[PDB]
Amino acid sequence: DATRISRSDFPADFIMGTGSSAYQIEGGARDGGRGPSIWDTFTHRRPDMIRGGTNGDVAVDSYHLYKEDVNILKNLGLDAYRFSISWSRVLPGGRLSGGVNKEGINYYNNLIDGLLANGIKPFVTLFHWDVPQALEDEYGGFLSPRIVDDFCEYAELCFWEFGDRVKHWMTLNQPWTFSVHGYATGLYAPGRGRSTGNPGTEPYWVTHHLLLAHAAAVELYKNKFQRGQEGQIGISHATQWMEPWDENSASDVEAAARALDFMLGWFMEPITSGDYPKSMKKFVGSRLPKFSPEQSKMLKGSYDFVGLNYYTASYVTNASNFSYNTDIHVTYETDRNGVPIGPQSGSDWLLIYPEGIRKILVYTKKTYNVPLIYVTENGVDDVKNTNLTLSEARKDSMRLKYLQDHIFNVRQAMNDGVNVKGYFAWSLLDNFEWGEGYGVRFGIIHIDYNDNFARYPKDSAVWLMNSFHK
Amino acid sequence: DATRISRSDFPADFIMGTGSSAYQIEGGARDGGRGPSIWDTFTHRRPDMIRGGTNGDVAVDSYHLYKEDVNILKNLGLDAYRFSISWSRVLPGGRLSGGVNKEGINYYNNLIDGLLANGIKPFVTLFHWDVPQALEDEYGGFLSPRIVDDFCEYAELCFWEFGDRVKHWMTLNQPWTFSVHGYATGLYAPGRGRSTGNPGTEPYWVTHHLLLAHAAAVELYKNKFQRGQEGQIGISHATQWMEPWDENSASDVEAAARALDFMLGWFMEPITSGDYPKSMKKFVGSRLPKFSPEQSKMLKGSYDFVGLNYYTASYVTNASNFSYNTDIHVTYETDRNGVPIGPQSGSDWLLIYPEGIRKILVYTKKTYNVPLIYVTENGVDDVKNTNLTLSEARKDSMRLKYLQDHIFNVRQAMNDGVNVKGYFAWSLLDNFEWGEGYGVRFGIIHIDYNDNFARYPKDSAVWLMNSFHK
Amino acid sequence: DATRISRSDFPADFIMGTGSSAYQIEGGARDGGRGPSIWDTFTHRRPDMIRGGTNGDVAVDSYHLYKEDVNILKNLGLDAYRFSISWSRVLPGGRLSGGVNKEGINYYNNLIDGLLANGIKPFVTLFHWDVPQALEDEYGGFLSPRIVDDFCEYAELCFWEFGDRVKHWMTLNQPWTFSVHGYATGLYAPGRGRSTGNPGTEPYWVTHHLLLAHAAAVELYKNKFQRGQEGQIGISHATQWMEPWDENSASDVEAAARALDFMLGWFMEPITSGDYPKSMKKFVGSRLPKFSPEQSKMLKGSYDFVGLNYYTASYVTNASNFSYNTDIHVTYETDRNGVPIGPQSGSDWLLIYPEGIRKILVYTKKTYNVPLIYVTENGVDDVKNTNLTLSEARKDSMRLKYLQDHIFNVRQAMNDGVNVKGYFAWSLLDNFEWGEGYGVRFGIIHIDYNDNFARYPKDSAVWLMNSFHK
Ligand SMILES: C=C[C@H]1[C@H](O[C@@H]2O[C@H](CO)[C@@H](O)[C@H](O)[C@H]2O)OC=C(C(=O)OC)[C@H]1CC=O
Ligand SMILES: C=C[C@H]1[C@H](O[C@@H]2O[C@H](CO)[C@@H](O)[C@H](O)[C@H]2O)OC=C(C(=O)OC)[C@H]1CC=O
Ligand SMILES: C=C[C@H]1[C@H](O[C@@H]2O[C@H](CO)[C@@H](O)[C@H](O)[C@H]2O)OC=C(C(=O)OC)[C@H]1CC=O
Ligand SMILES: [Cl-]
Ligand SMILES: [Cl-]
Ligand SMILES: [Cl-]
């Protein structure tokens, strides 16, 4: 049973942790010499696109309050903390000739030594959507294949400055979301595809360039750093469990496999076999870029581990100019007869379905044969409500149950044979939630926006410490 | 023509300034030894009563940023600035035995010296609704008449500490509003009037205690300080022009004059002749307290100048257990025959009626025969809109026009023989707006809540500087 | 005689001074939150275009050493100092929504109070080529007419922050050089015209937009600031004396008038009469933009004074796809029979011809009828020589004679009837000289690049103090 799950149900080397990303927590957007990212410009030029018209200029101020975040982490007692570096903080002009920012480097070094002083292992992500405005403006950012070399320079700086203490790297986090909402729906930065954007072509190019940036950085680590620093490198993917609306309709079963193909296979097959998935070549056809054979050779097996981010699940059925959305030829169902696949969380797109994580995990292992997996993101948001006082606000039973059920399911997946090495809840703190602004709370630590972002643990944090301390 | 109005249309001694109140701008609610006010407890225990569930903990942080505000005021170039002292900042327990807070005193001395170093005269208000919670919890704040002595100790403290530099004092600002929304409607702190409250009685006791508090303090200043410090003391009243729905119906001319009595007369009659107005005694009867004759003797003439606050206007006509609102026996109407008395501003209760200020001014001199008047508040809010970028947000055309029109009308009232010595715009900064939270913007200085409350002047400020500098 | 010229040869109100521009002296390119200008990017991306491949990242560090520069200015004893603000220092994203940089504002306030503490009048230039990279990248900077509104926002900030102490403003300095070398020759930033650039069209558009930016800012000052702040506003133009190769050839005489038309008339006629000069309409024809009539009304008489920058002179004769260079249809001669118009300075393009300044001054007064003139730039560079020790290096007799002869000629122009109100030597310090890097020294104060930019006065500085002190 789930409510009894605890650290002793897992192997000794298993790792528990929490996470954040730079733009959602740091603030200090124009402090310590940081240059602007595309999220800075998007939130400031297109405030109508953000709930409340807000931005992450200050966010929850971890730039200044990191000593406090570290204390929280020490009190929480878990093994590891996942965070990302802001590219334009260390390189404000995105490329080397734009200047190297010592002060931004000093910030991450302080954060990292702080965590190590306290027995907390840092897991570091190079990239979480925050493309330096300078590169976006000079050559369209990830639209251009120039992005691959600049990203490499960026990565080499990080390995050089931090790699003596950081032993666990990830190139990208959730590239799917960046591609799709950046270039297909236009809801996220840079906000294209609603020249001006083409949901039919751009997403495929962006993704193509993401994968090459990732493979080049991995080759760079492996050939120039791994032997001296002895770390490991990988990548983190968005996933959603895709379930056949009708378990009988072989048509529905294939729609579900195709949906997986277009979300996770899009990224996973290239680093497994060096190529896009069959179904995408078929349905996308000539709008889908091709890898030179030496590229395929670089991509193939370009990782030491893979992380999966899981939130929700869905029923899939077949569908009946172009765009990524329509190329998939599926339709999404939440109800199987006015019977929802699971209950709503605070967000109407997030339906709670614990077994989804067990299935995605088993599927990933079987389909792609990954030797080593971490769950790098998993969590839920509180029902919105500005009426509660802190004693009420902090009682987050839904999240508490959500975490138990999902962690229990991760344990199942390991019995099923999947080599899962760790699990990170998302997120540490309530923070900036992109298009949703500050209205949506994902943190195990509450934040009081009315009082300098005072931090206070929620019952889930207390529970994680008690059940998983070490 | 209003758009041409400028300093040279006024006598040389005429004073121009802006204003704030402590709880709306300061923040530092628990910093530097401040104790809690009733507004602190209200917003924190009843967040459902505030748009957004927000409070004044940080507000716009003038507590830490007061140097910038002073620099803004120097650039603005007007003669004077009107602010209030937070009672529970200088005396955290409200009464002397609660402790005298040196840091609180030091803050105001720093503020006052900065203003004077820059040639800006301070006009200081002892009280603006922020009753120390300790006095509220010990004896019901302004319900009890103990409040009069405590208020007196508070006042003496301020005169002794600051009276060498501050030469213009006001005991209270907007007491009407405190009484009515505090104890009749129960929308503002302490939030009483559905013991749990009683809109039939408490409002009248509260007003009774407010006036005795004001009179005690004026006797104190006048007997013990005035000769040595040579300052002046006064008080500041809420006003709203009241127009007879039908200029003819001599019964409407009556509903109007009765609406005046119940708003402005309720406070001005006592300091004029020592008693409440007839209309009020008749309709309220025995629920309305009496003044001992020594009290009447103390109240009568208790001021060196009066300040009027004016925002809007209304049509009044006659009406059809007990409650202040029903005791008035009037109904308010916004239009004659589908025509609004004036256009809306960002706020639906605020209709723009420049002529009301001329009228209110003339009425006041005529009915109560005040020899010296200041307009202590007058301003309007922006239309809410989180979609605008700063260069759009700062074009505050409506405010600019509103200021010009009201200032023009004040100038007319002077031609009519009313002796006005100055006018203060409300308010200097966008800030906390009580039940409205941060959603409503009254500042001539824009405030960016996403980025540490960055301040930036609106066109109204630039126009004030250019048209009234000296 | 020239060598005897001194302050007593001039009227009492006459003003003497020195000058610099932001990018040439400040450094601190990425300090205190400054954003990049087009000169940052040009020098860093195209180092081959700068002698030595250097840039102004540190320059002569006046950002950090300004207290020392102020001491020098105090020792030098002249009335005034001319400097420019770095647009992207106060607005790092060029437009308001890119963030207002308090720290950059604080720097100029410190500089300005420093100068005022010492009896030195500040003359301030809004713009000296340093276009914020953000605006160049978003919409092509001065190619787009969007530049006019952003430039206005920028100007309003400056007037608001500094206008209480700065009483003498200039919108642009040397716009000619910016247009021509930015867009016709491509030698300076942004380096176009060698899409990709069109020397035939772009220079004319850039210039057109410069003039509108200037006229809008002047309208802004005059309508919204001048009455409260009581300052004055103007602009500074490049000039070169143009002399008929053959004093007889009426053909040569017209070539000279046409050359003046294309250098100085290009800017001067629009603010005099509201239109470009006749000769340019003729030779440029339909490639020359046109002013709407309300634009002409804005431009006409848009200045309180004009400053002229004079360095050298030339002989002009007639010439025999498109480009600004060829549109002029003149040829430049330095020799009148192997007899050079004047001797070389350290730069082969700079030929010393003192009477040139007297003629340009008289010509400007007669042709355009300007009531009030300042010479805002005038000076010469030392022969390059890295072999001299400081005692030798500082003996700058050529500059000393250059200054005497030119100042003498300014005095002549005033006898000739021109109302000249002041004269500023260029420059205060040796500094970054654009395409020439650090190899070229224009300062009256020597700089030691080998030793933290130690400052040391040259004989010319000593002479100016002695002869013009006050
Ligand atoms: C909405 C954003 C992403 C989400 O991106 C994550 O959202 C979190 C909450 O806003 C963020 O805190 C986090 O940065 C991001 O990984 O990742 C998962 C999604 C999903 O549908 O499940 C598969 C997407 C939501 C779908 O509409
Ligand atoms: C709503 C608050 C007060 C208002 O009180 C002022 O409100 C400002 C805006 O919220 C405040 O910033 C300020 O503290 C206060 O003086 O003063 C005038 C009112 C009126 O009806 O016209 C006479 C009241 C509004 C009536 O419903
Ligand atoms: C070379 C740059 C400009 C020069 O620009 C000035 O050059 C100085 C020396 O490099 C600079 O310090 C200064 O910024 C600038 O005003 O202004 C005058 C020129 C001229 O030919 O005389 C009319 C130009 C030189 C001609 O080739
Ligand atoms: Cl580079
Ligand atoms: Cl006491
Ligand atoms: Cl803007």
Curated annotation (Swiss-Prot), chains A, B, C:
This is Raucaffricine-O-beta-D-glucosidase. The active site is at residues 174, 377. GO terms for molecular function: raucaffricine beta-glucosidase activity; vomilenine glucosyltransferase activity. The record marks 347 as: Directs the conformation of W-392. Transmembrane segments: none annotated. Its EC number is 3.2.1.125, 2.4.1.219. The record marks 349 as: Controls the gate shape and acceptance of substrates. Belongs to the glycosyl hydrolase 1 family. A beta-D-glucoside binds at residues 24, 128, 173-174, 311, 377, 426, 433-434, 442. It catalyses: raucaffricine + H2O = vomilenine + D-glucose; vomilenine + UDP-alpha-D-glucose = raucaffricine + UDP + H(+). Glucosidase specifically involved in alkaloid biosynthesis leading to the accumulation of several alkaloids, including ajmaline, an important plant-derived pharmaceutical used in the treatment of heart disorders. SUPFAM superfamilies: (Trans)glycosidases. Changing residue 442 to Y: Reduced activity. Keywords: Alkaloid metabolism, Disulfide bond, Glycosidase, Hydrolase, Transferase. GO terms for biological process: alkaloid biosynthetic process; carbohydrate metabolic process. It comes from Rauvolfia serpentina.
